[PDB]
Structure 1
Amino acid sequence: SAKLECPQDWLSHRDKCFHVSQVSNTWEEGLVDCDGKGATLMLIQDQEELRFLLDSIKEKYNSFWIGLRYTLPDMNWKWINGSTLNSDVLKITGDTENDSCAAISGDKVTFESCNSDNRWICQKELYHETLSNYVGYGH
């Protein structure tokens, strides 16, 4: 499924194409690293996305930065490209009051400080979307 085309080093899914960098950086660094390919740091659209992530990720138990940043004031998560997180997919906080960014860890989404040494996922855009609600505390 290639809506538009992406390079061969990338896995295409619907309307984006992904690259799982198993090398570590901070969230901010991986973001800039994705920009290096003329790509963006991963902007999750749906559950199919993450399921396809799990297929490319494979190892699961690492931590891979995606373009998830908790935006204040709004207490929702926006992406770096200006897209908006599908909060209804997996465990992510709605209101946390932190500078916490999110990372793939396991089969789930997790969140930590952007300064940890984690790997990152880049997506090379075919399209982009916005749809979010509010998870609240996570309860």
Structure 2
Amino acid sequence: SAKLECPQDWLSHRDKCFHVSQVSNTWEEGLVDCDGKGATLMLIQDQEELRFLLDSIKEKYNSFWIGLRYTLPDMNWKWINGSTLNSDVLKITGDTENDSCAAISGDKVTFESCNSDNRWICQKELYHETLSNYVGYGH
């Protein structure tokens, strides 16, 4: 769609706005930082998303956490919203079996122990009221 309004620091792209925080935190901690604004830790759908990231990244020679968590036991990458990773866009090894959480580092995506001091990317999705689903359960 045409995107709704988001705070000025947040780079606006197809219905989502990004804050490329050049300050470091741990993965879960950066996630909480996104929670703090009423936003989410970056949820990537397609490579169009990341290509705009590469524009907004600016530095590249850093690493910025996105909402990619490696869920074990399962061995798939899931997002914080509960979606499945599109590993086909860039280098994100699915079968790694490590304590990994992923971060943008340059034109690549890298992954390491979620506890590493790294910067992060918050996205505030302009469409967060898209599908809430359920009326609870059905009582």
If the length of structure 1 is used for normalisation, what is the TM-score? 0.86
CA contact (8 A) 1:85 1:130 kept: no
Return closer, same or farther for 1:112/1:90 CA change in 2, 3 Å cut-off: same
The structure with more radius of gyration: 2
Q: How far does the alpha carbon of each residue in 1:38-73 deviate from its partner, in whole angstroms, 9 at most, with x for none?
A: 000011111111111111111101000001001123
Who is 2:99 aligned against? 99
Whole-angstrom distance in 1 between the partners of 2:114 and 2:81: 17
If the length of structure 2 is used for normalisation, what is the TM-score? 0.86
Whole-angstrom distance in 2 between the partners of 1:132 and 1:77: 22
Who is 2:75 aligned against? 75
CA contact (8 A) 1:93 1:136 kept: no
Q: How far does the alpha carbon of each residue in 1:62-88 deviate from its partner, in whole angstroms, 9 at most, with x for none?
A: 000001001123321111121221111
Percent identity between matched residues is: 100
Return closer, same or farther for 1:86/1:7 CA change in 2, 3 Å cut-off: same
Structure 1 residue ranges without an equivalent (≥5): none
CA contact (8 A) 1:92 1:135 kept: no
Whole-angstrom distance in 2 between the partners of 1:87 and 1:135: 33
Query: How well do the aligned residues superpose, as a CA RMSD in angstroms?
Result: 8.0
Return closer, same or farther for 1:128/1:113 CA change in 2, 3 Å cut-off: farther
Structure 2 residue ranges without an equivalent (≥5): none
Question: Would you say how many aligned residue pairs link Structure 1 and Structure 2?
Answer: 139
